[PDB]
Each structure stands twice: as structure tokens, then as C-alpha cells.
Amino acid sequence: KPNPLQDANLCSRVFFWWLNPLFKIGHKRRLEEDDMYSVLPEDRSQHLGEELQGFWDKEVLRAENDAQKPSLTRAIIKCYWKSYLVLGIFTLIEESAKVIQPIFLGKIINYFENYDPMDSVALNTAYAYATVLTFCTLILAILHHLYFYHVQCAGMRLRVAMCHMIYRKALRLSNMAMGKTTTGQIVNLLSNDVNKFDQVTVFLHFLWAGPLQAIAVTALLWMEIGISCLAGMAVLIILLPLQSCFGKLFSSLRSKTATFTDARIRTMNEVITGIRIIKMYAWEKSFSNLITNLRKKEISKILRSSCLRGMNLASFFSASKIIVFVTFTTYVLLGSVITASRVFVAVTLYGAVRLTVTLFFPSAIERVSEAIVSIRRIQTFLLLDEISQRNRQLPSDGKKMVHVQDFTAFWDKASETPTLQGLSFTVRPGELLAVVGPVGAGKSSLLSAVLGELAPSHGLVSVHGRIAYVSQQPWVFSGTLRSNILFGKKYEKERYEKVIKACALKKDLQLLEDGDLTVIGDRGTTLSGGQKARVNLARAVYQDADIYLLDDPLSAVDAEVSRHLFELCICQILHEKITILVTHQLQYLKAASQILILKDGKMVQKGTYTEFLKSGIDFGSLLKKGFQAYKNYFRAGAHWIVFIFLILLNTAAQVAYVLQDWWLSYWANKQSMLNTEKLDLNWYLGIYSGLTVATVLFGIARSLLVFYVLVNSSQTLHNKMFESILKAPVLFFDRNPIGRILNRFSKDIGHLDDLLPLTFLDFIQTLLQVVGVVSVAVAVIPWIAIPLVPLGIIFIFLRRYFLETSRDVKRLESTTRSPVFSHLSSSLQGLWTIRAYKAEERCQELFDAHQDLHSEAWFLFLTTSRWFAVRLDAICAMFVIIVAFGSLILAKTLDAGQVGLALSYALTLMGMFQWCVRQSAEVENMMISVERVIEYTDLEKEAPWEYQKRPPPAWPHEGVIIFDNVNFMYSPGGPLVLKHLTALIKSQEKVGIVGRTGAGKSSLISALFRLSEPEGKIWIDKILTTEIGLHDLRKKMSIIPQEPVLFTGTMRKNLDPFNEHTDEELWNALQEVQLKETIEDLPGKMDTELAESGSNFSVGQRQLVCLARAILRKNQILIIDEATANVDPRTDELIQKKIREKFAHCTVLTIAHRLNTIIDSDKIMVLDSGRLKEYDEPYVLLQNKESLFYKMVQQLGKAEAAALTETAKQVYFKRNYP
């Protein structure tokens, strides 16, 4: 992938002419990673990393010699100052040109004031000054883009070198340092703490070019207009503390809103997760009240912050007008006169110095502070204690063996008991040494000590030869299964096939789409734990090391796979290699040549399996311990009359802004056309003050109205979205995951609430300023409207051409960034396995390649932006040149005031044009959140909660249920679940529910509750379920679900959200459920907040709370669904007994996976794939062996079957025959 930048000349590099093929390809089709240009040799990660590493080591050595702390900042400066001085020269030149050009503007105006049509020398001089002005504009418009690209390239180089150094350090962190730190911190100081270097270098050179430009501008202003410039300078200086105060208050007002936003998001997550339980209980009104209160509380603070930001923007808009008004008011009041060669030079100088003082200097200060903080963080990281490099090995005879003598060490030096107590043993090739012990013995500690991870406090360890080590937890890195097995070594087909066959990985390969080439992500999302363990063992065997160390290889695999592995990949293959193995299964101890028993870090016994059998101590014994989007977004805010008023306000503000400068020009012309007689100062100064006041007030009003309208639109959209969500049927929640649902409530609404209104206001402001500049230029010289049409057409086509490729470049850069973090995380998690072999330089090379693949896209991201900016600035410079030369060509018509006004506005169009284009692009990007919110606004809605026809309040009187021809489908067009169910449930009868694991037992409650609209007729106390609203039907039947859920709140809230009961009644219910004494010992009597689903409460406690809820509701129809699954027998018996005794006179339908709980039921439904087979007493079903009830009873066993039959017979005899 050759880089055309390596070929281009200086002329092509100035205009970025070498990116045209890339833009052509991007316009034609989509851009993939194969279309990117490889980085230049000087920008490769390894080169920069090694250069900065050498400089940093030299600085460290010097600092240690001098005996002070080292300075990463000093190292970086010593490395990059020579390359960062030339950019300083160029920014000096650029700032000098910026300061210079108003002088030539004033010279042109001065020529216009002393016009003489017959003179030609003055015309020639004016043309020369115009040429110099065009040269200055070209300098500011053309070369600045190459300068900016190099400025950003410096920061990119710094960041790449920093990342390389950080990874190189992290690859050799000691055990204690790794215990201090975490993987998250190391990933964070690459994802967030290294990106400050991209931004520090942009504004770094302004720390000396800001005050210098301010001083030069002040000197020029004093030379031009006199002492009156001090008032404008004072106002400009005062402008900074106002910004500081605004930013200080805005941060507090913003941080005061997260405490409501996070609570709202947490409640939303709870609602979305437990939507089925809420719908069954009909608590949507309570949750709606809670969410509404939280939203209002957050919206108040959002409104306050928006008002503050609008005031800040209005202050920026009116600052220049205020400065100029004050300056020229004191200038005129001191006794001078108004002239166009001075007014419109002071205006331009004030504008330039105001931009520089207000924005660039504070931005530079902030970026430098952040970069210093990040540098200090990385500097602290780079001095963590590192593992001492494996020193010169003791001279041996080349034999491969492992020996340990008198070893004693501890991970922590403050521990009372050492990790290992005087270990002393040796192992030779061909010996299968096994270590057997309980959890915590220290077998993995012994293996780590052999590897060298445990620093020997006392004793000696002699290990020679290559090492094969198997971690307790299998590890898979960012690659493929073939890559995992190869571990970077050269691929051999025969050896790979031999290892695959020996490891029985053929089934795992066949289970994958690509087989052995399938990509496995972080933590093996595409694989399983057994596959990871098999891959780890295969890699260890394939690497073909002299010494093999194993640690818990077969704990998490099946019996056949474990036996086949332990035999054919260890006993035969590794019979020529040194082997030390850690076991937990006793069946593999027979094949072990050596066995050691370890407990409490102390040696117990070592010998063969026969010797241990003769010892008499049992191992087992020892092992037991579009446009419509904009239209709807604007309509949701306010009426269209408000839109008309907003348009009028914007127009009035811009008109006053222009008219103040026009009035200055008119004053200058009227003073010039005079004669002593004097101008009436009262009139002119009064009109000036009125125009300034009107500009300020109109700007403030426009900003406030825009902000309020857009925030109201966001609030209305959120209300509509939540209202729609609360009524969507369960099918919608089944289709969409919880994360997707919560994303539109967390991120999209977050954008709409704070970012979009302010972005819109800024874009409108800048666009109106550009329109005003163009309108002034057209009004002064009408002929300028001719080339404006070609310029607009060219701009539109160029914008389309650029945007067809910029988005692809941005997505490529976004998708090429995560592999770096994934590789870092994988290498950090498998650091011991990486360091076991000598392959860490290969991991460094892989990381370098991953970093290069991202710098590949960053380069394009910078260059395409510069490519667009060059042409935009060319268009703007053409406009400026046209104005400046047409004014001189038509000198017989215009006058000084008009010429100066038009020329100054043409000069100020710069930067504003580019910012307007960028903000338009950003707004178009941001509208997708509004699109998604509006999409969720109009979801499908289920039946209304209430109907016109209301049943009597006493219904259900008895509780008789009729099922007639019930066909149930979860989704329309999906498979049928229930097939023509026909049954009658008499009042106050206990019915048990039986069938297979997919018989549809839990599908009956959905039909009864009408969660999904069923087909057929269901009659309850002679009312059909399809002619009454859902909230009037679900409220009269109680449900006890499989997994109880408790919502975060008070116990009174959890037991009675609608305050329909009394505290005494709730206490009586709690006493009935025997949880009252547990309730009344917390810090609060009944208002104790809980965690998610009551994480501090037991499962039995949650079931008991659900039973208490059912008791409190005290409805006639009770349904229980899979009550006891993994609860203790005591709580199971408690729940069964309480349910049996408390609801004697209430109809109960119970679905139980076990027949023990539902043996005493009066009747039993038999379900076969949604077909109702048998409905009668359980004794009758057990009488006939052909019944499915008898078959399932016999499936359980014999003794339990006999007990169940006896219990059913006893129940039948007691009930039917009293």
C-alpha cells in the first residue's frame, strides 16, 4: 500500500493534490481498510517508541546520577524541541501577517478619502496596497493548512510514542506492582489519558504568540486612534473574568443534574427489566409518577443551565459591538472627529485581538494544564517496580532439569504465614510429577515459583530449558484458533494436524463456521470454556518445550474429553519432556509417575501411586475440608407563530448588528462632507447608543427564545416516548433487548436535552453573521452578485463530494481503534503465560502493527479535513479579492465609508465560513437521535386499560373459569402454543398443572392475563375477558411468579404502591408471613431502601414478600407459577404450608415442575404440546397406567412414586369420602 504523499512535490503538498484518487474512490463506492494508505516510515510506531524510550532512559540515568526525580516533560522537550521550533517560526509569520493587513486596509480607505479622478500615481499605489492585502490573505488561507497538518502530526507522533512506551513497560510489570494496579487503569491511560497529546500541540505555540500579538495590536491602536483605545482594551480584559465565572457556575449547575439523571436512568432500567411483572401487577401508573417527578426535577436544572449558556452566547455576540461603542464614544467625547481610515482599522484590529485574547489563550492554558496532568500520570506509571530480568544462568552441562532447594517466599511481606515452607525437590525428563491438595495448598504458588514469578526470599531455584506452562484459567487472545495454537510460530501443517487429532479438537472446529480459522474475540465470546482449555493445552503441547507445567487442566471438561486428553496428549506425547502437573481428579493419579501431597503450603508425602496406596492415607479423605424530522422536532416545541416571532427576532438582531457599523460609516461620511460649523453630537451619539442597546437586547432575546423552544421540544418528545413505552405489548419487549430500549432513554434524550439546542443556536448565529457579511458586500457593490452564483454552486458540489468520503474515513478510524485496547487487555490478562515463553517481543510487534493500523486512518482523517479546508479558504479568498479589487475598479461611484465597511466585513468572513460549514455538518449528524426518539414515539399500542362498560365492583363473586377453544400464539404468524383448550374450573378448587418442560404450562397465565391477545373465549363469573380493559381484568387475579422481584424503594412502597391499605394491616400481613420481626430490626422501621431486586434479601425472603403481596391484595383468584426451584427445604415447606392454609376459600391454580407440591390438588391438567389430554382427580389418573400422569410418576422412580400414589389416595379418601 504505497503512500502518494512520499511522491508529491511542494506544490502538490500545499494544495493536498495527492488525495484526489482517494476522494474519487470514496465517491464511487465504500472505503475499506484495503483502500487506506500505509504510514510513512518516520511515523511507524516502533521508531517513535524506541526514540522516545532512549531519550527517557538517558534522562532517567542522568536524574538518578544527580539524585533527583526524573522528568518525562524534560525528556519530551529534549526530543521534540528541534522539530517544534520551525512551526513556531511559521506561526510568528502568520500572526505578523494577521496584525499587518489592517494597515493596508486603512491605506486603501485613505486613498479613497482623498480621491482625485485625474491622478494616477495614487491609483497605482492603491493597486499595490490591494495586491499586498491579497498576498496576506493568501498567506493566511493557503499555507496555514499545511502548517496545521504538521502541527497535528507532531501530537500524533507524541501520542504513538507514549502508547508504545506504556505497553513496553506494562509487558514487564512485577507481581506486586500488578497487584497494586488494575487492567482498567492501564486501558484508561491509553483510551483517555493519552489523547490529550493530540490537542496540546495545536494551541501550544499561542502561549508566546498571544501576549505578543496583543502588545503589537495595542501599539498599532495607540499609533492610529490615540488614548481612546484603552477603554476598548479594558473592556476586552474584563471579558475574561466574566467567562471564568460563567464556566465556574455552569459546571456546578451541570453536576447538580446528574444526581437526577442517573436516578431516572436506574428507574427506567428497573422498569424495562421487570416489565412483565409490572404489567401483571398493573403498577405502570406508580412507575409513571416516579419517572415524571424525576424528569421534572432534572428538567428544571437543564433549563437553568440552558439559560446560562444562552446568556454566554449573547455576551459573545454583543462583545464586539460594546467594545467598539465604548472606544469611539470616548474618542469622540475627547474632542476628535470620525474618519473612515481610522474607524474601520480600529474595528479590524479590535476583532482580531478580541478573538486571540478571548479564545486562543484560555484554550491553550486549559490544554497545557490537561497535558501536564496526563504527563504526570504516565510518568508515575513508568516507574513502577518491574521484574528483574532473568540474569546470567548458572553454568550447567546442558542437561534439562528442574531443581528447588530451601525455597521460602511470600507474595506479601506483611503475612504471618509464608506461602511456601522450605520446598526442596527436583524433577528430570520423563517424570510425571503430580501435586495433590485442597484449595489453598499452594500448588499454583509452586508452579509460579518454578517460573520465577515468586522472588526467592531464601533458597535457590535452578531451572534450565524451555518451559511449557498451563494456566489455571484458559486464555485466548485477539486472533484465531489457529493463531492461538501457533502462538506466532511458523505454521507446520503436519504438526498442527497431529496436535489437533491428539487433542480431539475436530468437533470444536466443526462447530465453527470457518473451522480452525474462526476469529475468537475477548474472553472467547465465540467459544466456550472447554474449548478454551483444549486450545490452551494444544498450544502448550504444540510449542514443544523441554519442561511442561500443568495446573488444573481437566476440571471444567467432560469425562471422555478429559480422559482422552490426559492419555494421548500427556502420557504418550510428553513422555520425553519434564512434566509437573496439578490435579483434582483421582482417576488420573494412577498414570502419574510421581505424586506429591501439599497442604497449608507444607510438604506431606511424595512417591508413586503404589507407595501412596501402601501409605494408607486416602486422597479423598485429605481432599475434604430528512425534512419531516426537522418539522416534527420544531413542532414539538411550540406553535408556528412562535417560529415566525423567532425568525423576526433573528432578523432584527442581525439588522441592528449591521446597522451600527453602517451608522458609523454614515457619520464618517457626513463629517467628511463638511466645510467653524460642527456636527450635532447629541443626535449621532444618541442613535449610536440606541443601536448598540437594540443589538444587545435582540441578541439576548433570540438566544433565550431558541433555547426555551428547543428544550420544551425535548421534554415533550421524552414524555411522548415514555407514554408510548409504558403501553407497548410484551411482544415488543421480547423483540427488543433491554440495552436497546435503555439506549434511547439514556443517550438520545441526553443529546436532545443539552447538546442539540446549543449547537442549533451557535449554527444559526454563525450562519446569520455570514449572511450579513454577504448582504453588506452585495449592497455596497451590486455587481458582486454575479460570481456568487457560481461560487455557491461550486460550494454545494464540493460539500457533497467531501461528505461522500469523510463519513467513511470517520467510520474507518472508529472501527480501527478498538483492537489496540483488546490486545492490551488480552496481553495483560495472560501476562504470566506470555512471559513463560520468551515470546514477548512478538507481542510487542503485534501491538505495533495494531497501532500502525489506527495511525493509518488517523492520517487520512487529518489529510481529508485539510483537503476540504483548503478549497473552502480558496473560495473565501476569491470573494475577498473580488470585493477589494471591484471597490478600486469602481472608485468613481463608492466612497470611503462604504468601501471601508464592505472591506472590513469581507475580511471578517474568514473562519466564520468554515465554522458555519462544520456546525451544519455536526447538526446533520446529531439529528439521528431525534429520528430515533420520534421512531420510538409511535410504537404499537395494546388494548386500553379501561372500557366504557365496567363490570360490577364485586366481580369476581365466585371464581368460575371457562376455557373454550383457546388458540394462543405469542406472535402473529408464529407457531401455535395452545390447541383448542376446553375446560371448566369450579370455584374454590385447587388445580395442579403438569406436563413436559415444553408442554405450555406457563402459557396459560399469558392467555388468562391477555398479555398477548389470545384466540377464543374465556369466561370468568360470566364475563368475557375480551370486553373489559386490561387494568380492570388483571387487578382481580393475583400472580406469584417464578423469580420474585423487589423494586428499589420503601417496604410500604413494595407492599402497597397505591397507599390503599393501612400500616396495621401491613404489619398483620407481615406477621402472617413471619417476616415482621425481620422487617422491624433495620435502621428504619418500614422505610429501608434496598438494592437491585433486594440483593441483600434472600430468595426465600423475596418469595415470602410476594406471598405477603398476594395476601394484601386478597383477591379471589390466585395463581402460582414455579414457586420453589432452588430454595432451601425449610423455606419451601414454609411457603407451601402458608399458601395451603391462607387461601382456603380462594380459587388457586398452581404450576409446579415437581409433583410433591401439587399431589393434593383436586384436579390436574395434562398438557401434551399444547393439547389438553386429561382433566380429573389425580387418583383417577393414577388408576389408569396409560395416563401421562402415571407415566411421569413412574419416570421419577419407585419409592417417590409409591409415596405420591399413597398421598393422592389419602387425599381422595379424605375429601370425597368423609
Ligand SMILES: CC[C@]1(O)C[C@@H]2CN(CCc3c([nH]c4ccccc34)[C@@](C(=O)OC)(c3cc4c(cc3OC)N(C=O)[C@H]3[C@@](O)(C(=O)OC)[C@H](OC(C)=O)[C@]5(CC)C=CCN6CC[C@]43[C@@H]65)C2)C1
Ligand atoms: C465560552 C464562550 C465561547 O463558547 C468560546 C468559544 C467562542 N464561542 C463563540 C462561538 C465559537 C466557538 N468557536 C468558534 C470558532 C469560530 C467562530 C465562532 C466560534 C466556540 C463556542 O463555544 O461556540 C459556542 C466553540 C464551540 C464548540 C467547539 C469549539 C469552539 O471553539 C474552538 N467544539 C468543537 O468540537 C464544540 C464542542 O461541542 C466540543 O468540543 O465537542 C467535542 C464544545 O464542547 C466542548 C466540551 O468543548 C462546545 C463548546 C464548549 C459545547 C457544546 C456545543 N458545542 C457546539 C460546538 C462546540 C460546542 C468557543 C463562545
Ligand SMILES: Nc1ncnc2c1ncn2[C@@H]1O[C@H](COP(=O)(O)OP(=O)(O)NP(=O)(O)O)[C@@H](O)[C@H]1O
Ligand atoms: N499472584 C498471587 N498474588 C498474591 N497472592 C497469591 C498469588 N498466587 C497465590 N497467592 C496466595 O497464595 C496462597 C496459596 O495460593 P494457591 O494455593 O496456589 O492458590 P490456588 O491455586 O487457588 N489454590 P491451589 O489450587 O490448592 O494451589 C493463597 O493465600 C493465595 O491468595
Ligand SMILES: Nc1ncnc2c1ncn2[C@@H]1O[C@H](COP(=O)(O)OP(=O)(O)NP(=O)(O)O)[C@@H](O)[C@H]1O
Ligand atoms: N415469549 C415467547 N415467545 C414465543 N414462544 C415462547 C415464548 N415463551 C415461551 N415460548 C415457547 O412456547 C412454548 C410454551 O411453553 P412454556 O410457556 O415455557 O410453558 P412451560 O415450559 O411448560 N412452563 P416453563 O418451563 O416454566 O416456561 C414452549 O415451546 C416455549 O419455548
Ligand SMILES: [Mg+2]
Ligand atoms: Mg494452585
Ligand SMILES: [Mg+2]
Ligand atoms: Mg412456560
